[PDB]
Design an enzyme around this catalytic site. Structure first.
Site, mmCIF file in Angstrom:
data_model
loop_
_atom_site.group_PDB
_atom_site.id
_atom_site.type_symbol
_atom_site.label_atom_id
_atom_site.label_comp_id
_atom_site.label_asym_id
_atom_site.label_seq_id
_atom_site.Cartn_x
_atom_site.Cartn_y
_atom_site.Cartn_z
ATOM 1 N N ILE D 14 0.838 -1.196 0.000
ATOM 2 C CA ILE D 14 0.000 0.000 0.000
ATOM 3 C C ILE D 14 0.878 1.254 0.000
ATOM 4 O O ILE D 14 0.604 2.193 -0.741
ATOM 5 C CB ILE D 14 -1.003 0.014 1.188
ATOM 6 C CG1 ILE D 14 -1.990 -1.154 1.047
ATOM 7 C CG2 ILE D 14 -1.764 1.348 1.247
ATOM 8 C CD1 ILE D 14 -2.989 -1.264 2.191
ATOM 9 N N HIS D 181 -14.928 -1.698 9.552
ATOM 10 C CA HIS D 181 -14.325 -2.270 8.347
ATOM 11 C C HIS D 181 -13.959 -3.714 8.692
ATOM 12 O O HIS D 181 -12.922 -3.968 9.307
ATOM 13 C CB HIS D 181 -13.063 -1.491 7.943
ATOM 14 C CG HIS D 181 -12.300 -2.117 6.821
ATOM 15 N ND1 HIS D 181 -12.770 -2.153 5.519
ATOM 16 C CD2 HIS D 181 -11.099 -2.739 6.794
ATOM 17 C CE1 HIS D 181 -11.892 -2.761 4.750
ATOM 18 N NE2 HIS D 181 -10.864 -3.129 5.499
HETATM 19 N N1 LIG Z 1 -8.217 -0.207 6.697
HETATM 20 C C1 LIG Z 1 -8.436 -0.762 5.498
HETATM 21 O O1 LIG Z 1 -9.413 -0.476 4.793
HETATM 22 C C2 LIG Z 1 -7.348 -1.714 4.959
HETATM 23 C C3 LIG Z 1 -6.330 -2.149 5.800
HETATM 24 N N2 LIG Z 1 -5.247 -2.895 5.325
HETATM 25 C C4 LIG Z 1 -4.117 -3.119 6.258
HETATM 26 O O2 LIG Z 1 -3.034 -2.216 5.989
HETATM 27 C C5 LIG Z 1 -1.868 -2.833 6.575
HETATM 28 C C6 LIG Z 1 -0.778 -2.807 5.507
HETATM 29 O O3 LIG Z 1 -1.110 -3.506 4.291
HETATM 30 P P1 LIG Z 1 0.031 -3.751 3.157
HETATM 31 O O4 LIG Z 1 0.643 -2.491 2.769
HETATM 32 O O5 LIG Z 1 -0.570 -4.602 2.073
HETATM 33 O O6 LIG Z 1 1.109 -4.640 3.952
HETATM 34 P P2 LIG Z 1 2.678 -4.937 3.777
HETATM 35 O O7 LIG Z 1 3.089 -6.098 4.604
HETATM 36 O O8 LIG Z 1 2.921 -4.931 2.310
HETATM 37 O O9 LIG Z 1 3.298 -3.599 4.377
HETATM 38 C C7 LIG Z 1 3.355 -3.293 5.777
HETATM 39 C C8 LIG Z 1 4.745 -2.715 6.081
HETATM 40 O O10 LIG Z 1 4.798 -2.310 7.452
HETATM 41 C C9 LIG Z 1 6.141 -2.500 7.869
HETATM 42 N N3 LIG Z 1 6.327 -2.271 9.313
HETATM 43 C C10 LIG Z 1 6.204 -3.106 10.365
HETATM 44 N N4 LIG Z 1 6.451 -2.451 11.514
HETATM 45 C C11 LIG Z 1 6.723 -1.206 11.129
HETATM 46 C C12 LIG Z 1 6.877 -0.083 11.953
HETATM 47 N N5 LIG Z 1 7.113 -0.160 13.267
HETATM 48 N N6 LIG Z 1 6.958 1.120 11.331
HETATM 49 C C13 LIG Z 1 6.939 1.213 10.002
HETATM 50 N N7 LIG Z 1 6.823 0.140 9.220
HETATM 51 C C14 LIG Z 1 6.681 -1.075 9.767
HETATM 52 C C15 LIG Z 1 6.524 -3.847 7.289
HETATM 53 O O11 LIG Z 1 7.942 -4.045 7.166
HETATM 54 C C16 LIG Z 1 5.897 -3.721 5.897
HETATM 55 O O12 LIG Z 1 6.835 -3.240 4.916
HETATM 56 C C17 LIG Z 1 -2.248 -4.255 7.020
HETATM 57 O O13 LIG Z 1 -2.539 -4.404 8.422
HETATM 58 C C18 LIG Z 1 -3.509 -4.510 6.216
HETATM 59 O O14 LIG Z 1 -4.328 -5.484 6.878
HETATM 60 C C19 LIG Z 1 -5.195 -3.267 3.968
HETATM 61 C C20 LIG Z 1 -6.196 -2.823 3.103
HETATM 62 C C21 LIG Z 1 -7.259 -2.034 3.587
#
Ligand SMILES: NC(=O)C1=CN([C@@H]2O[C@H](COP(=O)(O)OP(=O)(O)OC[C@H]3O[C@@H](n4cnc5c(N)ncnc54)[C@H](O)[C@@H]3O)[C@@H](O)[C@H]2O)C=CC1
Ligand SMILES: NC(=O)C1=CN([C@@H]2O[C@H](COP(=O)(O)OP(=O)(O)OC[C@H]3O[C@@H](n4cnc5c(N)ncnc54)[C@H](O)[C@@H]3O)[C@@H](O)[C@H]2O)C=CC1
Ligand SMILES: NC(=O)C1=CN([C@@H]2O[C@H](COP(=O)(O)OP(=O)(O)OC[C@H]3O[C@@H](n4cnc5c(N)ncnc54)[C@H](O)[C@@H]3O)[C@@H](O)[C@H]2O)C=CC1
Ligand SMILES: NC(=O)C1=CN([C@@H]2O[C@H](COP(=O)(O)OP(=O)(O)OC[C@H]3O[C@@H](n4cnc5c(N)ncnc54)[C@H](O)[C@@H]3O)[C@@H](O)[C@H]2O)C=CC1
Lengths: 315, 315, 315, 315
Positions: D14, D181
């Site tokens: 994202i 959500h």
């Molecule tokens: N609220 C909503 O409508 C939606 C929520 N999500 C959520 O968004 C979150 C991220 O999704 P993606 O980008 O696909 O995941 P991803 O795994 O591709 O990216 C998450 C990143 O966070 C990093 N991370 C971990 N701890 C960290 C910290 N202390 N500070 C900064 N970075 C750190 C990881 O290394 C990783 O690169 C997930 O929890 C997912 O479930 C996804 C789609 C929609």
């Protein structure tokens, strides 16, 4: 519907960003084709929802069927490997992708010939200058309907690095990188401008030095390797470059963009594809511009083409 | 709200197109100020509805009150006359606007000094190079916060005419016109590029001739007169040029744009405003670029400045 | 080139803004046709230069020759009068434009039939609901290829006024005005939403009152008159509305837009044009949406159509 | 420079798409912060080159240092896990991300409080309604300066699926999904419109049936799971939704967008975050709109909030 149908043959990292940008710009319907089952459908579904946020109306479908190339107006080929399965990132080289991607181009070419012989083709798969000609021959398309990605991307990097040193809008720096997309790319110092002003004027004014420019040149050539060692084979900028080319074609903008195109005498070369500025419009490659290179620049161009020729011999 | 407040001092033809473009681009709130009662309110009302079609949210208000300059982030001055009340269109000349527009600039300058001394000012009123300095002096604003329209417009015409002969995207032709905005404007043949490639290469290839270019040069210089005799004092392109400048400032784009700016030694001139490429960003005129003109080009530049100096003496 | 050719039959105030917006959006080539000699050429020249500022590539030509309609993909008709030559602005009424604009539509219709029978036609000339049918009959085009401007403009005004009271993005207010474009326009209070939420909820919460809404309704109906008395017959918003319609058609967006279209049973009316939501896409009017009006709303719709029918009888 | 500084806390899928879209739209400077060494630098470098293709001027930097939050105008939190390390894709559930992402929010909150207490915060990490409140409490920011992603994304899916059945522009379908959500999201059938027209009218006309709508509802709720099983946790649409929210804030658009926000009595709930339409502008959450839900809809809303409350108890 007369909306353009754009088939992305290869739905990996670059394919994903391309689909996203096509919807943002409402360029046309998109087909994310790939050999991997279901993944293209997943990416397509995800991307299709952005039509809402973007105020667009572009269908985005996934596909595992070659026949979906039928009716394609533009075909973008990224299908293949980003690296050789056994080399370290430190030893990353586009040349090693030759034995991996050759067979893929032949297969895709046959499908293009049968399904969409009148489509405009953009080849991205590395080593690009070799791959584009291989696809040209197997697809049967006219020389003005197929180009390979290279210069728009390489120059974006050079233009960017210079714009940050001079503190000007990135697009205001114009530059030319020709011959081939790879380690032998020819960076033309003489053809760099800032706001249309020769770069030498900024060098004369001590705004940027020759030593700094030499460092910027090396960084440009090694950018892919630098990013590959930091993260992965670059995909965001490559995607943006490709879409700028595809957009120039679709909207008949007639932009001067450096791409790999069939050379028929330019720079003293024939029967080979090489990077050079071209004009992309409704009729495809409407003009192939030959830079009046001096002997030193031409010698560098010959070295670039030599590499393409060497790999074309599939060795 | 931190949205920029843009005050258009003068709500005539150019003012109208500017308000329209500001809403299209969602640049900020707009005030159409004018001496004419009710007209600015009418235009503002009409333009405000476009927020719907444009998916924007910019307030557009009319005004007949100078104090509305208070809180202005950008002030664009078009207030004045387009022609002298008694001359025929055939004898149209920007110089004759000198006795008509001088008093207007002084009045506006006083209000700017009192109401928005920290605003970025863009002067358009002709003869522009004279008017911009007059406003600079009476408004008290720093030299990096005031510019006059000239080169972006003049070059748009030159760039366009060449792009149509060469069949390339209009923006791909870069060119420079300096010194002053008027009949003595300096068209720099040496500094013209196409896709970043020197124009001379296209001349060498018989793609465009020196005779054709000479005709294009004359057309560029006489464009305002040509349009004035066909329709009226141009307003669409002038408006687009102004907004490109205002936009570079507001969005910190740092574009290299040719504008009338205070010269402090460049080209051998001081204490006068003249057209030259500048970099427009968040800090206003962030850089004044001096083209390394040869003696022949410098002689032409001197002739342009001489004209500004002559009218500055209000004679 | 496959770029769309857009012919603006009438190059006045609305025509000018349309040409400007078409270039900003790179919608296609533009022809500013008019009966007045040279003026269209002047406006076209002025507008063509904006291609540079807009990064577009749209030709903009003037014309005094009807045959330039040949090859037109979209024809926008604004040709005619904005007011009756003898009435005061205070007594301004679209109905008085009937004896002035009727003959013009017949003439234009004949040329469309001969030169571009397959073009998509947008009629603007007032009284629009009468004029559009007159052009439909004389041009011979299919019912799905001709519409008149009305609702997109009227609703833009209603949507805007409400958005300012509620402090929300103008586009977030959706509203419907049907029947006819004129003093009998039907403002459907029941069909107003804010962020997709029924307006009644905001009325219940005392965020906007019924009395305020009634005042907004009257302002919407009288907007043209209000602007005509402050400045002139509105042109900026009308132009933006028209281009949103033309754009939906050209880009196959399939937007739901209220326009005057041939009624074939909807609301109990046939053989007459009236304002109603339609879906504009590549196939023209792809859908005519009939609002399930209650008896009170239908009575108002009948009153609107009655007016069109009265003027259609050219009395 | 007054250009907005946008810190993306989390540079994964994202984060990558967000950086790409911010540059396309020239929204402001971007910092791709992440715990993973070098990757953010690689993505930033790749994305920075697009400034050329996009005609933008946004710096894009990578970071592994929390202090880079200093001076942030907008902070977007995606940091965390997309799934629980041991579950199959078939059993994918946002609730299982609770024990994985809680500690991350606390850590980030402390840094926000110390480095950028006046920043506008957008929380994305799942389970979002729980995570947003956790960050609100630990960051110390005012209730009008923090929101969670939910409704804009969920509704984009519902709006899209309906637009394809009805053949209208995706943005023309407006819909509301509230409460939370996740699997208990409340799809409000009563609040769906097409071109501003109640959906029930299209149901009455047999254009779409109740059975089809019920299938579309189930697809909307299960979209993330459907894509997770086809490819991966969705990222393109989520990124576009987030940027639409961030953009409304930065440009003071005042769009009505459904987001997770602190409830203070609305729907009978307090001291908890839940999805509901809000107005996002320069002052952050400028308005919290309470839909006048009926008892049946309110019962569903209570079930959604119950889930957030259950996980908030970290069980
Ligand atoms: N609220 C909503 O409508 C939606 C929520 N999500 C959520 O968004 C979150 C991220 O999704 P993606 O980008 O696909 O995941 P991803 O795994 O591709 O990216 C998450 C990143 O966070 C990093 N991370 C971990 N701890 C960290 C910290 N202390 N500070 C900064 N970075 C750190 C990881 O290394 C990783 O690169 C997930 O929890 C997912 O479930 C996804 C789609 C929609
Ligand atoms: N020409 C240039 O300037 C640049 C070239 N590249 C090249 O572009 C190519 C793609 O790069 P990425 O998207 O990052 O790689 P990727 O590995 O993410 O995506 C390539 C996709 O091609 C698929 N594929 C393999 N055979 C296929 C076939 N027969 N038909 C359709 N799909 C098939 C793979 O499953 C994969 O999903 C690589 O060769 C890379 O070296 C990358 C950047 C710039
Ligand atoms: N610098 C350049 O490149 C160009 C300069 N121009 C100049 O821009 C100026 C405006 O051009 P147009 O908009 O076409 O003219 P216009 O006549 O349509 O508009 C000028 C407006 O200024 C108003 N005005 C007079 N005194 C005023 C005052 N004290 N404060 C505010 N408003 C006042 C007039 O009522 C009128 O509405 C002219 O002097 C023209 O020569 C035009 C094109 C390009
Ligand atoms: N339908 C709607 O929602 C609206 C309708 N209108 C109408 O649009 C029409 C145009 O408005 P404006 O552009 O402001 O008027 P205008 O007077 O500025 O322009 C009309 C142009 O039509 C020209 N013309 C006359 N006969 C012609 C012919 N045979 N072919 C081509 N051109 C010819 C005139 O020379 C003039 O340049 C008017 O009838 C006005 O009432 C205006 C706003 C909205």
């Amino acid at each position: 519907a007369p909306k353009a149908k754009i088939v992305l043959v290869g739905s990996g990292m670059i394919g994903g960003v391309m689909a996203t940008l096509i919807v943002q710009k409402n360029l046309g319907d998109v087909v994310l084709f790939d050999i991997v089952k279901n993944m293209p459908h997943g990416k397509a579904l995800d991307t299709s929802h952005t039509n809402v946020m973007a105020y667009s109306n572009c269908k985005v479908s996934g596909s595992n069927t070659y026949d979906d190339l039928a009716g394609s107006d533009v075909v973008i080929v990224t299908a293949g490997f980003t690296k050789a399965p056994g080399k370290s990132d430190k030893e990353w080289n586009r040349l090693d992708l030759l034995p991996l991607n050759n067979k893929i181009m032949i297969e895709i070419g046959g499908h293009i010939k049968k399904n969409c012989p009148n489509a405009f083709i953009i080849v991205v798969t590395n080593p690009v200058d070799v791959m584009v000609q291989l696809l040209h021959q197997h697809s049967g398309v006219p020389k003005n309907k197929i180009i390979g990605l290279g210069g728009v991307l390489d120059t974006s990097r050079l233009k960017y690095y210079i714009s940050q040193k001079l503190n000007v809008c990135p697009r205001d720096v114009n530059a030319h990188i020709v011959g081939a997309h790879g380690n032998k790319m020819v960076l033309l110092k003489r053809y760099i401008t800032v706001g249309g002003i020769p770069l030498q004027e900024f060098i004369n004014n001590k705004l940027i030095s020759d030593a700094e420019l030499e460092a910027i040149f090396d960084r440009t050539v090694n950018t892919a390797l630098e990013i590959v060692n930091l993260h992965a084979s670059p995909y965001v900028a490559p995607a943006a470059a490709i879409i700028e080319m595809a957009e120039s074609y679709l909207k008949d903008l007639k932009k001067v963009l450096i791409c790999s195109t069939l050379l028929e005498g330019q720079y003293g070369h024939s029967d080979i594809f090489g990077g050079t500025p071209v004009v992309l419009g409704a009729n495809g490659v409407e003009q192939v511009i030959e830079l009046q290179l001096n002997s030193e620049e031409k010698a560098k161009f010959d070295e670039a083409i030599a590499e393409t020729k060497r790999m074309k011999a599939l060795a």
